[PDB]
């Protein structure tokens, strides 16, 4: 009934935004900054 509707709505809000949050986190300069992993330019 309405419970399945709310289940679908709750699973539609979160999954795409979580995937895009991960994509944004690693696309910008956040993954390198937080985890200490060096970017390829700085390598000597």
């Amino acid at each position: 009934i309405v419970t399945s509707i709310r289940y679908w709505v709750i699973h539609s809000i979160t999954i795409p935004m979580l995937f895009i949050a991960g994509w944004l986190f690693v696309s910008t300069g956040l993954a390198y900054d937080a985890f200490g992993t060096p970017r390829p330019d700085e390598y000597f």
């Binding site: 979580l18 995937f19 986190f25 690693v26 696309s27 993954a31």
Partner: peptide, 28 residues
């Protein structure tokens, strides 16, 4: 409970797979 037993694994996995998907493009 089952709710946590599933979500504790589900909620980071999508984040991580999206991360790896983007890394599959960030490579020059």
């Amino acid at each position: 409970v089952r709710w946590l037993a599933v979500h504790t694994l589900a909620v980071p996995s999508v984040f991580f797979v999206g991360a790896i998907a983007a890394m599959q493009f960030i490579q020059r």
